[PDB]
Amino acid sequence: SLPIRLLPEKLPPPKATRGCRLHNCFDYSRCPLTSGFPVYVYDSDQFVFGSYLDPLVKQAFQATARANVYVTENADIACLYVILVGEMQEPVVLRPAELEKQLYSLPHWRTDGHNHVIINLSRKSDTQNLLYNVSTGRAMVAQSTFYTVQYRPGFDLVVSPLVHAMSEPNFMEIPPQVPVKRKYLFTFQGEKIDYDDRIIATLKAVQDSKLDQVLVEFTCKNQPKPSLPTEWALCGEREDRLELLKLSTFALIITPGDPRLVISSGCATRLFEALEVGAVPVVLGEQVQLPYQDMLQWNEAALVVPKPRVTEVHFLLRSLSDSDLLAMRRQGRFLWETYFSTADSIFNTVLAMIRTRIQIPAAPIREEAAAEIPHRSGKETEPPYASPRYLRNFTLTVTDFYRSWNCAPGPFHLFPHTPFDPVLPSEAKFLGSGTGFRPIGGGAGGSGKEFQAALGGNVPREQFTVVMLTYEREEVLMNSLERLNGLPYLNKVVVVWNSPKLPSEDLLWPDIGVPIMVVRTEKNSLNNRFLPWNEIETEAILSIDDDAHLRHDEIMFGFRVWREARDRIVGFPGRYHAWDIPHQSWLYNSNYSCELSMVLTGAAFFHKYYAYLYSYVMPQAIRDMVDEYINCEDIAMNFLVSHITRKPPIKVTSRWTFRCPGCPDDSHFHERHKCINFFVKVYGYMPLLYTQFRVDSVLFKTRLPHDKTKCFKFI
Amino acid sequence: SLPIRLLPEKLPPPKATRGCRLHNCFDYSRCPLTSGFPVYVYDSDQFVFGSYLDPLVKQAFQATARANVYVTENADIACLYVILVGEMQEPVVLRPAELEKQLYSLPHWRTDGHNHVIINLSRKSDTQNLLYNVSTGRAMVAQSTFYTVQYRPGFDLVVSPLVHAMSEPNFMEIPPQVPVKRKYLFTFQGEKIDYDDRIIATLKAVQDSKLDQVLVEFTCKNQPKPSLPTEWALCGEREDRLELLKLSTFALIITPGDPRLVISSGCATRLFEALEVGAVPVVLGEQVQLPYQDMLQWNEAALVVPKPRVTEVHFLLRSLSDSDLLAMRRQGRFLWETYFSTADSIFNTVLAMIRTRIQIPAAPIREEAAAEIPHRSGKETEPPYASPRYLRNFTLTVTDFYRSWNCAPGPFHLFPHTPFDPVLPSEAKFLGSGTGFRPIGGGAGGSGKEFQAALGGNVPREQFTVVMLTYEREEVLMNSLERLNGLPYLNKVVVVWNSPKLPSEDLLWPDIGVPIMVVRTEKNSLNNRFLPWNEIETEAILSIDDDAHLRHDEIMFGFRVWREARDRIVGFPGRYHAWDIPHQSWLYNSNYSCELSMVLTGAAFFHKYYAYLYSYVMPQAIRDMVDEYINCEDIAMNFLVSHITRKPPIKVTSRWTFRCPGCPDDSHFHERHKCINFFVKVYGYMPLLYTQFRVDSVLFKTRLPHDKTKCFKFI
Ligand SMILES: *[C@@H]1O[C@H](CO)[C@@H](O[C@@H]2O[C@H](CO)[C@@H](O[C@@H]3O[C@H](CO[C@H]4O[C@H](CO)[C@@H](O)[C@H](O)[C@@H]4O)[C@@H](O)[C@H](O[C@H]4O[C@H](CO)[C@@H](O)[C@H](O)[C@@H]4O[C@@H]4O[C@H](CO)[C@@H](O)[C@H](O)[C@H]4NC(C)=O)[C@@H]3O)[C@H](O)[C@H]2NC(C)=O)[C@H](O)[C@H]1NC(C)=O
Ligand SMILES: *[C@@H]1O[C@H](CO)[C@@H](O[C@@H]2O[C@H](CO)[C@@H](O[C@@H]3O[C@H](CO[C@H]4O[C@H](CO)[C@@H](O)[C@H](O)[C@@H]4O)[C@@H](O)[C@H](O[C@H]4O[C@H](CO)[C@@H](O)[C@H](O)[C@@H]4O[C@@H]4O[C@H](CO)[C@@H](O)[C@H](O)[C@H]4NC(C)=O)[C@@H]3O)[C@H](O)[C@H]2NC(C)=O)[C@H](O)[C@H]1NC(C)=O
Numbered sequence A, B: 001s002l003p004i005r006l007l008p009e010k011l012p013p014p015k016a017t018r019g020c021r022l023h024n025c026f027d028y029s030r031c032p033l034t035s036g037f038p039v040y041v042y043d044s045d046q047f048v049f050g051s052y053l054d055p056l057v058k059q060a061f062q063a064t065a066r067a068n069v070y071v072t073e074n075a076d077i078a079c080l081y082v083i084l085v086g087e088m089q090e091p092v093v094l095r096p097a098e099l100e101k102q103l104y105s106l107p108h109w110r111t112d113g114h115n116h117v118i119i120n121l122s123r124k125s126d127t128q129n130l131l132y133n134v135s136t137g138r139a140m141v142a143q144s145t146f147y148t149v150q151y152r153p154g155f156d157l158v159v160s161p162l163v164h165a166m167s168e169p170n171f172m173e174i175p176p177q178v179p180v181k182r183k184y185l186f187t188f189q190g191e192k193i194d195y196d197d198r199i200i201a202t203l204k205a206v207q208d209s210k211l212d213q214v215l216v217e218f219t220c221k222n223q224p225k226p227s228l229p230t231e232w233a234l235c236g237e238r239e240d241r242l243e244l245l246k247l248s249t250f251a252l253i254i255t256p257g258d259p260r261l262v263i264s265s266g267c268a269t270r271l272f273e274a275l276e277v278g279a280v281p282v283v284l285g286e287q288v289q290l291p292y293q294d295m296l297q298w299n300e301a302a303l304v305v306p307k308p309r310v311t312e313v314h315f316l317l318r319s320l321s322d323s324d325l326l327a328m329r330r331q332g333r334f335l336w337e338t339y340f341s342t343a344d345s346i347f348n349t350v351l352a353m354i355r356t357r358i359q360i361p362a363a364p365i366r367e368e369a370a371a372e373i374p375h376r377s378g379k380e381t382e383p384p385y386a387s388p389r390y391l392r393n394f395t396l397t398v399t400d401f402y403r404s405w406n407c408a409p410g411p412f413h414l415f416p417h418t419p420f421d422p423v424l425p426s427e428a429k430f431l432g433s434g435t436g437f438r439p440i441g442g443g444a445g446g447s448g449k450e451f452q453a454a455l456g457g458n459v460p461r462e463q464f465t466v467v468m469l470t471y472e473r474e475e476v477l478m479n480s481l482e483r484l485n486g487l488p489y490l491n492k493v494v495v496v497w498n499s500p501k502l503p504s505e506d507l508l509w510p511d512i513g514v515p516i517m518v519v520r521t522e523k524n525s526l527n528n529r530f531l532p533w534n535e536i537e538t539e540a541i542l543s544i545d546d547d548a549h550l551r552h553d554e555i556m557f558g559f560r561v562w563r564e565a566r567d568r569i570v571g572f573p574g575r576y577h578a579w580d581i582p583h584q585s586w587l588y589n590s591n592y593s594c595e596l597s598m599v600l601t602g603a604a605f606f607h608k609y610y611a612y613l614y615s616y617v618m619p620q621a622i623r624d625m626v627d628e629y630i631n632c633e634d635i636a637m638n639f640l641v642s643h644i645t646r647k648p649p650i651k652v653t654s655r656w657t658f659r660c661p662g663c664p665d666d667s668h669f670h671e672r673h674k675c676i677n678f679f680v681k682v683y684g685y686m687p688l689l690y691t692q693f694r695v696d697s698v699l700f701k702t703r704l705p706h707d708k709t710k711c712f713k714f715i
């Protein structure tokens, strides 16, 4: 049944509009929890705002709105209405009471603008406050400048300036995150035309003490940029400021002298620019409302210090450990990239903030609809069962609010399942939550007999899907497929057919007792092994090359380990990244080693979640390099999983190579060094980590009494 | 240097007091970051409030304040001043403008009450609003009732009612957290003397549909408790309400009809009582300010739903998975126990909230100052080095704000170190952050030769401390101590001397090349093995029985695993908890097994952090049972670590028993079943989890070319 309707206005005084919140100004009857989040975007060219808008802001916004999954042309079903009103070209022609009249004239304003968001994106001006004298009815406002009189907390939205309108940021211009300490401990540049005076004297004295390398400037070389009253105006051009910030461990941001100025375009620009190049922001003044602060824990990316504690800032900056400081820089890069960096970022964030505030789940991430190549086949006791999907829509939107917004990958997509589902406590399977659980010995445990009879573990039973990439290797494919006949817990085999030429019509595919789905590929890419094929109906994927020889016992043990390490790559070929001491860079190393940091996906388990991330969220430059060299997709997936988890992979059994006994250049090996170092440039840091152990079954090589059996014969 | 002083008042209008925030009303010059957080508590018996106070509130508050580590009698050094003003006995004799005059008369009010917190704790009344007509100067207010006009967000504090004044809650009366689903999906009891009417009709229709078992009552059997206008008054007595809530999966809380009533004592009592017995709160009305909401992510413990979405509540409650619902119940127990349950909880929370808001670290957790028993001794190349301490004071207070408050153990103590310090990315050790790092092969890696020469890993080098408990076993003690001679990375051996009788004067302790510190125990307890002895100068503890035989290679491998699993018990004797199918309870099981859930601390590594938690934070009832049976401290530590981490332990090597080859009842074994099931009652759930693997060195049992060596000879 529909949510209860908000009673509209039948003109409302300024005190009434300042009291708008979701609980009294939003019409939930337009937004059932299960109806998606349809968004109507007004075309600003049909209204007075269009011709006064900054042209780059308008163009970038229109392009993002056209590409957005939530946007509908059907106003009668929309939950949210979006109007872009600025920023406007300077000098601002349009008068305020006029802006108000055109808002109230919008096609679907109804009496009061309920369920509207007014978006006003900064780019070139730091003095605009377009809506100050404007009654906004029941609409929300999203912009970078607010005085206290106008900001409605939990209702309005503080957003990022739109810097890269109709451009793309170049990540290769971002300084590496390591070394932690840069030339200057901190810097500041500004000019101002209460506590201000002590701040200046304190910071000047830090510089004069020569206890650290700092650069603080309280005038600009040339004329400062125009600003609001009491603001530390920006100096120079963006390119000048960034050159210093790239050399700064920390960037000071001194909030405006007037405490009523909650946030300004100029302040938000200082934040943007510091985060863009890894200078950890140090914000003096707690009265500030940073962009998206209702959703983001800004203390993880920025020091936000009261102005009276300016006398302690030097000590504080010197007291942070390298690992804590690096974590702050890494978090700043995540926040900046995800929520600030592009028009897509900003629009996605506005919509996700409103959607999340009204408890609606994100749109489901897309998948690879596969074209099956039907084929003919040649000549435990239950049939395949799929993993259940979309069981946590509300939990992952609302209950998991902190991680959804403050941990990669962010809040924009709904996945069918993830590796981070909480485990039930171990008594629940016996006391009412036992569906699908298969405890060893019915809960009494046991030795190898009981162990082989039941998956056990801490989660219900499930199956896995083999994904096998093939190209021009038809004979070896049929044979390795035949090796899967009889494999326990196998749901199906997905064969990714990369060759331009289709499978010969006269082909007898082995009957292995589960479906073999051959999927056609629009192009020939190693990246296709990590596409989230529609045909994969499990969470667990066993990724295997068409020439890998794994025994069934090895696969079964790997599966059981993965079921207890669901966020990891769990697999057989362990490798590591080696430091090239003279060249100060990385090398790929596949020697026998006591320490590992990668498990190759030519023989490994991982969660389907990472197929979605690899394919649709991870930077395009990584997939492009994989296709340039036809190499390194295994390295790329290890980078991705270790970035998300901050853990090494898990290596299973004493196996080192995994091809056939009888089965088989240098340039390919050197490409892997180049991949590793390029991926580090894309990420900004090396995410791989080392492990000094492998996993074996509990009773491996253990001498047992006669009434006990090993978990496995050989592993 | 001191923080900048706030300029005082030289009477201030209501608009001014409603604008108080930390940035304009708090004097940071009284609170340097490094001066602790000294708190002065007024004795309310010296002021008019004392004789009007509720006597149980006053008595419980005074007792907590007397026992508090922050409280000082020296007003000239205090950062914060605390005055208890209520709740008052009914009918309220004292008039408002009078309350105001006595506040302004407090000894250290100065002109305006800056740096004061006025505490008004509810217990018996739901109609009091003592400070409504009271000017509070620059003081903060902590209470359970606020209208919008009076609540200053980020400055005032919404707190819990004081239910157990001068009593202790009995955890054995709390229903177990499992089964997830209880008799009633949801319940509500209230009576009210806008959206209200649709809520009633919607919920009545859910009950009438008989699609779930629910019990919703909108009148009380007898006269309802007095309440504020538009509130759903409480029914009956606390004992009546709890009896129904114990049978409720979810508890509805319908917020007051008047949106200006931000929170009330009655609403906060409904929250308290639901959380007390595991009913997951479903709060209808988002305008509410729940207790401690600035610090706590309430969505993790409660569904907070707009009143218009009442028509979707039934669907929502039915859509939550068992594991998500159980996680919400578990989080509610943590929040309730830590911040609501006792006067200590509430006072600790008020002080910690203010302290955290002004960026000051918690007081350091105490330690066991040891009495060394000096002794005489009988007859890699560097000397012992201690682990560094207190490197994250600001980070763990401010940057880690989310986890500090929303994850066990909570925010009240500062530890010297913890197992959750973020790791540096793997290039940082080569590019400026390398102090203490010992990479294998200088970063090039290698095989067993290179591996034995360097700890490697992802953290700098460190040492470990052996902790060995002994009692009446003097001969075997000298011998097992001698087995530690030559052990790499050993900092020292702490011998915990439990026997009432001291060590014979004529005793020659072996010289093993590191200090042997023998510590005297005030009493003979197994719990003493987990005291955070002053003498332990490392993070890593190797806990070993006086009769355990470990080889040096085993210890070294275990240490390397622990260095990469620092939050886990990493050790040798693996055991598990078995379900007793007919009795629906747990058993201790030490058979050979393919699945483990405990590693016994008679031979295991763990972080000193858990010694502090075990000794000083974990429930006393667990330590009491250990002393009653002289048993089960190993089980207790596994419960603790798996509760904190939600992970199983890690078992190292194929060893099952760990006593001497030649070395050695039933009642002791049956005590372990009783311990396991009692500990489950204390926690509310079983925290142990299963693992189906052990760890071995990477090249264990691996065939190698001649130019490569195994990491270890035997493991
Ligand atoms: C098993 O374990 C062993 C031991 O670690 C490991 O051997 C090492 O292998 C690496 C990589 O192949 C070697 O590093 C390279 O050294 C190059 C110079 O090597 C000479 O000198 C050593 C002794 O000093 C001799 O033993 C050796 O035989 C050679 O005569 C050096 O040029 C390489 O640097 C390339 O890559 C880095 C990026 O990290 C880049 O910065 C460099 O510039 C260089 O790239 C080249 O750039 C030029 C232009 O600038 C360009 O023209 C050229 O195309 C680029 N590409 C190359 C390939 O040069 C690198 O440092 C190391 O010496 C070996 N050590 C030993 C003791 O042999 C095995 O590789 C491991 N086996 C497996 C299968 O993993
Ligand atoms: C290695 O692995 C084996 C296989 O799992 C395991 O053997 C099991 O051991 C457990 C525990 O010792 C046994 O469970 C107990 O069974 C009791 C009855 O057992 C009889 O029946 C079986 C066949 O049915 C016979 O084989 C057996 O020899 C006996 O004749 C049962 O009474 C026990 O229950 C106690 O504990 C629960 C708490 O979980 C409690 O609820 C019970 O009430 C009972 O407590 C007793 O209460 C009474 C009053 O109510 C009180 O007077 C008394 O003092 C209390 N204490 C006891 C001890 O009774 C429990 O269910 C199980 O039968 C064994 N299985 C087999 C196949 O033998 C080994 O223990 C493992 N070895 C190691 C070293 O781990």
Ligand SMILES: *[C@@H]1O[C@H](CO)[C@@H](O[C@@H]2O[C@H](CO)[C@@H](O[C@@H]3O[C@H](CO)[C@@H](O)[C@H](O)[C@@H]3O)[C@H](O)[C@H]2NC(C)=O)[C@H](O)[C@H]1NC(C)=O
Binding pocket: A034, A361, A363, A364, A390, A393, A414, B319
């Ligand atoms: C959690 O979110 C997912 C994803 O948004 C929801 O899945 C979607 O559910 C709807 C309704 O069941 C599906 O639409 C329906 O499709 C069927 C065909 O099977 C059609 O007959 C219906 O008339 C309707 O169009 C939709 O396909 C499905 N989306 C996906 C990607 O599976 C799910 O319902 C949500 N669960 C809860 C409990 O809220």
Ligand SMILES: *[C@@H]1O[C@H](CO)[C@@H](O[C@@H]2O[C@H](CO)[C@@H](O[C@@H]3O[C@H](CO)[C@@H](O)[C@H](O)[C@@H]3O)[C@H](O)[C@H]2NC(C)=O)[C@H](O)[C@H]1NC(C)=O
Binding pocket: A319, B034, B361, B363, B364, B390, B393, B414
């Ligand atoms: C992080 O917090 C810890 C714990 O509060 C701080 O440790 C404390 O530091 C003070 C000042 O150094 C110590 O007091 C001093 O003791 C020395 C004796 O060594 C004495 O000569 C001085 O006059 C003064 O009284 C205090 O003992 C110490 N506490 C503990 C438990 O070690 C630490 O300083 C903080 N670190 C940072 C960077 O803020």
